């Protein structure tokens, strides 16, 4: 159990550090689990999400609906994805917010810096697997 006497175990301070986090930290919290197959490929379990990833929501009321991410909206702790969208009363079309922890990154937008991140998060997992 916690042994490091520098990390708080207080609900108040943890909720501060969560809901008051800057954008550079909200990126890391906006992480989603990879698909099983892409996990098998890249030897990592979770990744923070990007502008143009293909996600497949698994637990919202929109289960099974694959869609490209269109707007990771870090303020409201949501992401907007293609066509997973609803209709106002008047008839305007609005994308709904799905928390990043409820999507799985089926296909990944390989930036070179993302490749580097996948390398680091891969060898970190595997060097302690072995």
């Amino acid at each position: 159990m916690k042994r490091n006497p520098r990390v708080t175990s207080s609900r108040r301070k943890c909720r501060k550090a969560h809901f008051t986090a800057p954008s550079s930290v909200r990126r890391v919290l906006m992480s989603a689990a990879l698909s099983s197959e892409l996990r098998h490929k890249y030897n990592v379990r979770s990744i923070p999400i990007r502008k143009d990833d293909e996600v497949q929501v698994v637990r919202g009321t929109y289960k099974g609906r694959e869609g490209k991410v269109v707007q990771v909206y870090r303020r409201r702790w949501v992401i907007h994805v293609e066509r997973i969208t609803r209709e106002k009363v008047n008839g305007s079309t609005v994308n709904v917010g799905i928390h990043p922890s409820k999507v799985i990154v089926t296909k990944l937008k390989l930036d070179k810096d993302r490749k580097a991140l996948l390398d680091r998060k891969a060898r970190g997992r595997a060097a302690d697997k072995a």
Partner: protein, 252 residues
């Protein structure tokens, strides 16, 4: 306990002063000035809105109480005695219908275990794992204000493993299991030997700790114990079987 108190200055950061009599209102102090709703409102009372509390809590309460060293030792003796009686453990709330023997003692091969799966496997030979599961599935959120004062989850109490070889790795193998506690044999703790004030924590002694429990607590002899100035208390009766006393030939 940690101390808790209200501020020295609560209620007394208003500069109010009683209106005195003759204003058709009570004689309680009232705030001066104007331009607010606060003007004219009562203050400095424990009955006011925004005043003190009666006899405010202060940091110099008696938080820590003292018990005689010999009385702590006597109590640890009685708790150790109560660990040995199967009816006391079963009354106290541990699922023991499959443990082999009391007091339950396992070999020193337990001392070398490292992993939590290994600790579970060790509990499987014993009968403890019914109790350990009882704690694990009885973990649940603490009702009341404790679920926001950083006391979220409560659980039951599981077996207390006692080891003798200090620096062993069962302390780290058993730590993650909910409800299960690990103790060293030199420094037994009453909070573990009798949680809640009730007798009979289900204790699992390792074979190293068990054979030096005599060297630690000793017997009815001066200086036999590793503790100074301590001998085991003697009961006010040698034999507590009222059945045998009353039904003995002498009495009858």
């Amino acid at each position: 306990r940690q101390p808790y108190a209200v501020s020295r200055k609560a209620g007394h950061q208003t500069s109010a002063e009683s209106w005195g009599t003759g204003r058709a209102v009570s004689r309680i102090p009232r705030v001066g000035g104007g331009g607010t709703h606060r003007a004219g409102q009562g203050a400095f009372g424990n009955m006011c809105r925004g005043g003190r509390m009666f006899a405010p809590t202060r940091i110099w309460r008696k938080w820590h109480r003292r018990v005689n060293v010999r009385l702590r030792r006597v109590a640890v003796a009685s708790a150790l005695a109560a660990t040995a009686v199967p009816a006391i453990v079963t009354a106290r709330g541990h699922r023991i219908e499959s443990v082999p023997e009391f007091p339950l003692v396992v070999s020193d091969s337990a001392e070398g275990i490292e992993k939590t799966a290994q600790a579970i496997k060790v509990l499987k030979q014993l009968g403890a794992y019914a109790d350990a599961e009882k704690a694990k599935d009885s973990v649940g959120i603490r009702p009341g204000k404790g679920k926001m004062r950083n006391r979220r989850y409560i659980n039951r109490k599981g077996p207390l493993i006692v080891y003798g070889t200090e620096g062993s790795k069962i302390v780290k193998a058993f730590r993650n299991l909910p409800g299960v506690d690990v103790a060293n044999v030199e420094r037994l703790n009453l909070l573990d030997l009798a949680p809640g004030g009730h007798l009979g924590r289900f204790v699992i002694w390792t074979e190293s700790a068990f054979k030096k429990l005599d060297e630690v607590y000793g017997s009815f002899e001066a200086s036999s114990s590793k503790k100074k100035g301590f001998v085991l208390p003697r009961p006010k009766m040698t034999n507590a079987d009222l059945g045998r006393l009353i039904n003995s030939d002498e009495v009858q």
